[PDB]
Amino acid sequence: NLSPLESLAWQVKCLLKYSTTWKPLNPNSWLYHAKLLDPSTPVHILREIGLRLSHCSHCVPKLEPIPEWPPLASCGVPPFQKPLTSPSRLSRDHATLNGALQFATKQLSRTLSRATPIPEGCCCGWLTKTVKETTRTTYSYTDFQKAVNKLLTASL
Amino acid sequence: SYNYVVTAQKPTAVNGCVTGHFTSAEDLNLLIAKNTRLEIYVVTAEGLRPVKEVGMYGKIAVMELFRPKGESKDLLFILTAKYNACILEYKQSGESIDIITRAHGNVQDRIGRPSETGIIGIIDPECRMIGLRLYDGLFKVIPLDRDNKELKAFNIRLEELHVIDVKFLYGCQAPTICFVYQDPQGRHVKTYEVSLREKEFNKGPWKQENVEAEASMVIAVPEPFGGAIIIGQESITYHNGDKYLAIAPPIIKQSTIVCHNRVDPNGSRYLLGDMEGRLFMLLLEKEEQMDGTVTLKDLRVELLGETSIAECLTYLDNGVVFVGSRLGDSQLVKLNVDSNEQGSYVVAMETFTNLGPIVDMCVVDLERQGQGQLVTCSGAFKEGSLRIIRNGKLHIRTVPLYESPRKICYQEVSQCFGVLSSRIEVQGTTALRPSASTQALSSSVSSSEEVEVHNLLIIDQHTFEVLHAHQFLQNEYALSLVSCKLGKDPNTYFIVGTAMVYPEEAEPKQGRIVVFQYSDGKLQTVAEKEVKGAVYSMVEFNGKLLASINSTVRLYEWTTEKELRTECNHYNNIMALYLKTKGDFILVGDLMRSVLLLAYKPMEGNFEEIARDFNPNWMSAVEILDDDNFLGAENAFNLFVCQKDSAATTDEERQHLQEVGLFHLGEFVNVFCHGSLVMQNTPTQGSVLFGTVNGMIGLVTSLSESWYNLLLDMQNRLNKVIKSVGKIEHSFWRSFHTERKTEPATGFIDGDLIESFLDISRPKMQEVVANATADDLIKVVEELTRIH
Amino acid sequence: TNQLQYLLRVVLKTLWKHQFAWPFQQPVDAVKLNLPDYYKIIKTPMDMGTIKKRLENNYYWNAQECIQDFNTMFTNCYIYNKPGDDIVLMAEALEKLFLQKINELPTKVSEQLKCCSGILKEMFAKKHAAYAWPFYKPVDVEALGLHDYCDIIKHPMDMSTIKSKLEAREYRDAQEFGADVRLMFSNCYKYNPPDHEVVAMARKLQDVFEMRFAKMP
Numbered sequence A: 001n002l003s004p005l006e007s008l009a010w011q012v013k014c015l016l017k018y019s020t021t022w023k024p025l026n027p028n029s030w031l032y033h034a035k036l037l038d039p040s041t042p043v044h045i046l047r048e049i050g051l052r053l054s055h056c057s058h059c060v061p062k063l064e065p066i067p068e069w070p071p072l073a074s075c076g077v078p079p080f081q082k083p084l085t086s087p088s089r090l091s092r093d094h095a096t097l098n099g100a101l102q103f104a105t106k107q108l109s110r111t112l113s114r115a116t117p118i119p120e121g122c123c124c125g126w127l128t129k130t131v132k133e134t135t136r137t138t139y140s141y142t143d144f145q146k147a148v149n150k151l152l153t154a155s156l
Numbered sequence B: 001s002y003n004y005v006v007t008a009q010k011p012t013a014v015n016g017c018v019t020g021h022f023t024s025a026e027d028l029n030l031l032i033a034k035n036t037r038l039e040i041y042v043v044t045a046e047g048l049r050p051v052k053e054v055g056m057y058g059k060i061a062v063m064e065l066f067r068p069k070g071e072s073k074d075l076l077f078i079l080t081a082k083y084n085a086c087i088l089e090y091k092q093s094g095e096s097i098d099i100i101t102r103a104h105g106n107v108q109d110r111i112g113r114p115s116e117t118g119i120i121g122i123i124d125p126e127c128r129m130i131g132l133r134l135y136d137g138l139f140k141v142i143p144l145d146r147d148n149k150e151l152k153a154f155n156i157r158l159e160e161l162h163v164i165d166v167k168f169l170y171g172c173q174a175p176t177i178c179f180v181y182q183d184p185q186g187r188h189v190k191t192y193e194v195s196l197r198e199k200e201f202n203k204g205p206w207k208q209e210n211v212e213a214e215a216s217m218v219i220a221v222p223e224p225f226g227g228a229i230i231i232g233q234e235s236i237t238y239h240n241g242d243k244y245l246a247i248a249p250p251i252i253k254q255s256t257i258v259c260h261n262r263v264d265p266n267g268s269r270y271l272l273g274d275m276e277g278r279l280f281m282l283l284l285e286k287e288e289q290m291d292g293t294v295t296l297k298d299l300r301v302e303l304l305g306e307t308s309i310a311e312c313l314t315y316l317d318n319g320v321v322f323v324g325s326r327l328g329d330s331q332l333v334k335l336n337v338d339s340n341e342q343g344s345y346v347v348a349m350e351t352f353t354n355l356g357p358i359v360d361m362c363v364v365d366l367e368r369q370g371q372g373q374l375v376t377c378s379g380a381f382k383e384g385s386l387r388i389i390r391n392g393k394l395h396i397r398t399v400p401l402y403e404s405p406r407k408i409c410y411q412e413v414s415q416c417f418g419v420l421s422s423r424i425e426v427q428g429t430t431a432l433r434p435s436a437s438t439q440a441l442s443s444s445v446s447s448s449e450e451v452e453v454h455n456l457l458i459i460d461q462h463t464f465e466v467l468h469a470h471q472f473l474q475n476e477y478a479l480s481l482v483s484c485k486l487g488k489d490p491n492t493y494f495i496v497g498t499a500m501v502y503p504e505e506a507e508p509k510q511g512r513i514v515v516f517q518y519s520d521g522k523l524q525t526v527a528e529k530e531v532k533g534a535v536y537s538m539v540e541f542n543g544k545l546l547a548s549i550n551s552t553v554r555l556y557e558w559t560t561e562k563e564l565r566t567e568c569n570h571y572n573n574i575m576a577l578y579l580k581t582k583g584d585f586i587l588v589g590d591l592m593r594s595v596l597l598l599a600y601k602p603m604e605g606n607f608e609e610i611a612r613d614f615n616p617n618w619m620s621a622v623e624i625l626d627d628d629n630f631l632g633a634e635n636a637f638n639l640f641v642c643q644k645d646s647a648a649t650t651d652e653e654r655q656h657l658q659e660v661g662l663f664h665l666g667e668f669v670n671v672f673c674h675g676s677l678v679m680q681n682t683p684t685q686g687s688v689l690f691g692t693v694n695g696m697i698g699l700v701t702s703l704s705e706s707w708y709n710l711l712l713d714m715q716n717r718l719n720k721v722i723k724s725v726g727k728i729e730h731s732f733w734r735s736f737h738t739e740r741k742t743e744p745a746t747g748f749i750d751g752d753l754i755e756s757f758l759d760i761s762r763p764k765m766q767e768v769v770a771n772a773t774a775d776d777l778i779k780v781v782e783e784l785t786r787i788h
Numbered sequence C: 001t002n003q004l005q006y007l008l009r010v011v012l013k014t015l016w017k018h019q020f021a022w023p024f025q026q027p028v029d030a031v032k033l034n035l036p037d038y039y040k041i042i043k044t045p046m047d048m049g050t051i052k053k054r055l056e057n058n059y060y061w062n063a064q065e066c067i068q069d070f071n072t073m074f075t076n077c078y079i080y081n082k083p084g085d086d087i088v089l090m091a092e093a094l095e096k097l098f099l100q101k102i103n104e105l106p107t108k109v110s111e112q113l114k115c116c117s118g119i120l121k122e123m124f125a126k127k128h129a130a131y132a133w134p135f136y137k138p139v140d141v142e143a144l145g146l147h148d149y150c151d152i153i154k155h156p157m158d159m160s161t162i163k164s165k166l167e168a169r170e171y172r173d174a175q176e177f178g179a180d181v182r183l184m185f186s187n188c189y190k191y192n193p194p195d196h197e198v199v200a201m202a203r204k205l206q207d208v209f210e211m212r213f214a215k216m217p
């Protein structure tokens, strides 16, 4: 019994697949590896759309891209390669960050270092109508993200 | 927007030092470079007499000394993290002292990826070339001749990309370089000849050979011994042609080695720093034969004692050794000839005040006279402490804790600080040394390889004695703390957020929110709520407790039954680390999505996501200057001001938070907190004080349009007069700079530059002000300096 | 036996109604589906409908024969396709749901218009709402960006319009209704390329519609 939110996310993903203006974030981006976005359940497409990680170029032509991999200063791991520096020196370097960023950096460095690269008009209006008709006539991207925000807030 | 950023306490961490005949051929100088500061000392039998301190516009990351032929005294080579490079000479004329720039230039290539192990700089002993390694797979050489006053470089391809360390060798007909490179087969040493004619590499004197997996340092021995020593995690080796020697003493197998220096110009004795504070000495025992030649026959390592955790060592004279530090106090030590009552041969002489790495700070007034006082956690591991700072120049008390501090919060109702902390124990676990967590007047525990254990300490304001210490559950890490009064309850509570940890989990799946109370001189639990995640921060919000659990930002209400109840949620973030509040608004800072702004709606009961900033940054700390101006800092050593756009034509343009200001601070910012350090009962408005990893404590205020325009023109006028040391253009130093984009500075007045106008001579002031008078501007400077 | 009955009446019923069931409910018609290499890469094609037929007419001799059939159905989809394909996600979800459930395994014109109204009401049921939803309402030329759809198709149609016409008795006889429905499907066929998944859904719904309408009085 698929949940209502999963069913809606599934329809969103399937319909969006065929839009030539939809530009999803690169599936090899670090987010997919550090387990910050679950790749199994389809719901993550909404979470992306919530954060403007995935966007429609027609509505948003000049969005700054999200970096593929974090700068090594904040994770200490180069792209898909074990670090050169020994663990002890890394640990001594992370002790300078504050209490919270320290834990975040430790988590990221403990996770990414075992990653493996995975070998690889506008439909917004109807999507926004489907979402609102599920939670409750010309729209754009803004009114899509604003609706997905409320759906997530009231669903998860 | 407009702002004004000034330096209050200059940085005090040490990240590079060198010794040589700099100021004169007769004297001996110890040169300590700290971030954007360059300190000069002269050694005497009494001690160190500082002669000159000069600030430079660039993070000094490579410093070296060399004496080219024809010069009566050494010359200084400085390369900053922004790839400004210059060669300096110490020029004295009677009582006046000047630092004159011989040659300067930039060596930044258009494209490339900076190496993991950081910038490396090395010089030929014969002074024919300057080596550098600024990118993977490229070696950047700089011919050393008087002609090359613009520092024209030329590259040379490197066969292997992953270079760990590289050094020059003594005694070769042409310059020779040895290094360690890694490949799938393992780690190997190697050699080349750097031909200055062909501008290319040639095969070197001896062959590549395998080394220990952790081989991570290179030392070049002088004549006659030859060769280089490779310092590893579990063994040490000496390689020179057919000669080969190794030693694996168990003494050093307990901890890693991080720094080294040469004691005897003949290369018999070396000092090796240790991460636990130990200070080993390395002895090379020589041997000779009938041919009259000299060769090595054995290696010995012996332990001398304990010192501050060392980032670099150096020898001056009569056994006086200087130990710089990035995590503690910079010490001068005496190396005696006999063990001193305990097996230690080491004795301290003088200790220097070091503040960084600040990891938290809160502004209070213990005198209750309206006078400011900063209390700052500082240090790491066995050098943790609290530095109470109050205005006089500053007075800096100290309180060792012998364990890592993380957080602090001031609680007036009972007049005691609450401090989190963490020590290090070795797996049953055992303690390594006494620490506040077990030296307190009273102790209790929660009961609802190196492994950390975290404690919450209650510290009295009058005596800073450790009143009590509470130990958190096994494997649990305390992350955030705050003191507040909840709802209608008249009590005052400590609230601490914790996050469980396990090896397999990539995102913590368990945590706790714990409420403590302090009365009758004792600490006890009152309320605890289990949550599904870590807790990166918590805040007092109009009587309600605002927390962030993993990506969600949550709001809790304090019932009359002494429990926390959920009010409303939020889920539009990657990982919410930082929080701040003013009235109703909330300024959530995320891991990578910069600053998010909310507004709590009382008559509806939910958060309204009124804006965002979309540019990707890696935030470190965020703070609010007013209802509509937000300040934030990122590991790129910059500051940027986010402002809710006032004029917007569409709904979309009201979602963007515009980055209306950009400034390259030159320091890793680590925490913000409102407050000030002068008596109160003027151009600038407001105030915010922020710590740094390098110890630099700074102040940020707002400016009215007119003052910003005036100070911008004043700043531009100064750069045409002030002869910056190293000839680095000011705008290039203060430009926003990252991996992605570059931008000129806008919206921030460079405080340290303006104050310098107070030093220039009267003719220089007249030329500065030309097209008004100096005094009508000296008053402006005076009003500005009074804020710190 | 008991396990066969359990599979037929619990697992089969559960998997026959799931929101991801429809694509696997019929043999893989490669010719229509444009699958060139499919019939060389798999030697034993299998589908849920085959399993239901075998269970209902006791084609099996042992219960595990049907379990290996389900596993083969998952395996063919896994082998032919690559990670990241939607069919792969559907297969994974079905596999995990099956594993969850398997653990419990024990040890006369008026007559014609009435018929057409019944058929159209059937097409609206949740029984087919999984894949019949694209046609429930007129295709919006603006809310989906199809600029040319106004030009390429000259007679838009949708199930809601047909239902309204029937409620208004606009259809003098059932032949007009049949022509309208076939036009509704043929427009989708004509506009889209054969690869687009919408066509797959249209073919499914039209198969159901023909199976029902062939029995018109």
Ligand SMILES: COC(=O)C[C@@H]1N=C(c2ccc(-c3ccc(C(=O)NCc4ccc(S(=O)(=O)Nc5ccc(C)c6c(C#N)c[nH]c56)cc4)cc3)cc2)c2c(sc(C)c2C)-n2c(C)nnc21
Pocket: A014, A015, A018, A019, A126, C023, C024, C028, C033, C076, C077, C078, C080, C081, C086, C087, C134, C135, C139, C140, C144, C146, C188, C191, C192, C196, C197, C198, C200
């Ligand atoms: C891009 O806009 C257009 O185009 C024009 C417009 N678009 C739509 C529209 C577009 C797409 C979708 C949609 C709906 C569902 C799915 C879906 O669930 N996708 C999974 C899948 C994948 C392959 C197969 S399979 O059957 O091909 N493959 C296969 C089968 C079986 C087996 C065993 C295997 C196997 C193995 N072993 C390997 N492969 C296999 C079967 C199923 C995908 C897309 C829905 C709607 C649209 C309308 S009105 C309206 C409101 C909308 C949104 N609209 C109509 C009517 N007309 N045009 C349009």
Ligand SMILES: [Zn+2]
Pocket: A056, A057, A058, A059, A122, A123, A124, A140, A141
């Ligand atoms: Zn769009």
